[PDB]
Write an enzyme that holds these catalytic residues in place. Sequence first.
Site, PDB file in Angstrom:
ATOM      1  CG  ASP A   1     -25.768  -5.735  -7.562  1.00 38.73           C
ATOM      2  OD1 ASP A   1     -25.044  -5.147  -6.740  1.00 38.73           O
ATOM      3  OD2 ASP A   1     -25.424  -5.993  -8.739  1.00 38.73           O
TER       4      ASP A   1
ATOM      5  CB  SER B   1     -14.662   5.700   4.063  1.00 39.76           C
ATOM      6  OG  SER B   1     -14.154   5.378   5.338  1.00 39.76           O
TER       7      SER B   1
END
Length: 330
Positions: A35, A199
């Site tokens: 994770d 992004s």
Amino acid sequence: STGSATTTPIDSLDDAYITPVQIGTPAQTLNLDFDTGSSDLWVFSSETTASEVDGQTIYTPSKSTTAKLLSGATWSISYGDGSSSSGDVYTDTVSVGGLTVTGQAVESAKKVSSSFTEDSTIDGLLGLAFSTLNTVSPTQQKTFFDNAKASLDSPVFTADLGYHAPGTYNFGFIDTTAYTGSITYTAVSTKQGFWEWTSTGYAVGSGTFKSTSIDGIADTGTTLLYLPATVVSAYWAQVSGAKSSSSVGGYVFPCSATLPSFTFGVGSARIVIPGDYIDFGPISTGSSSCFGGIQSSAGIGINIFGDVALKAAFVVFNGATTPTLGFASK
């Protein structure tokens, strides 16, 4: 040193991926959920409340000659999905794919929430976010990667998750045969303890690319892709009959639909998520309403590039003094 381990989807939807981890001496192999959005290595154990164990493999520290109770140390964690777990702490030898760390904090669960009990395939979590998020008190502990870093050939790990197939976590090296083209690296902020990056935009299907900064986290422990409501609405508007259902808890779409791809930007590069990757199947057995793999982050507080996005790429988690993320197509 290096390590390399195969990671395997737990079910036919790729809801999560499990990776075998050797703990203790002799080894006890547990299948952990790696994770990158958390920083605790915790396991089902001989200490876990018996009614909360339902098929998981447990770590028994009393059977490990290298286990040592970390005196006074406790842990307690709550995840973004509302699940939680807590317990005490041992140090022990932990190996992943041939890479061994001695003295790793292994957090032994005394209590786990129902969602963990109900998932018999996941024996615990291995956190790979920054150690500043580790919950052990009163002495915070380091992640497996942090402990291994200095010994690794290069201070990196890579995630290569498969679509409906196994993939690979590598430590200490970048497998140049595992991706196409080049890896595009992008800046990371560690201010919140995550692999947080920005992004450069998105496209829906064959549509034009929208240049827009989307800050979010690379999170292998989250199944879906959680993005701003504007972006998610633009995606699902291209699927006839798709709608956001408050009762179901997100966007659903007719199972008869063909889904468009979704592209996200990494610098000037582009990662394309095929439409198939966005199908999470019927909302309940036999339903013709299917659950979408791109969902709004509006109620989370952060955008999350979960498995739906990451499995479309070869992803480099560069833990150099100034961390960065790398993405390549594959």
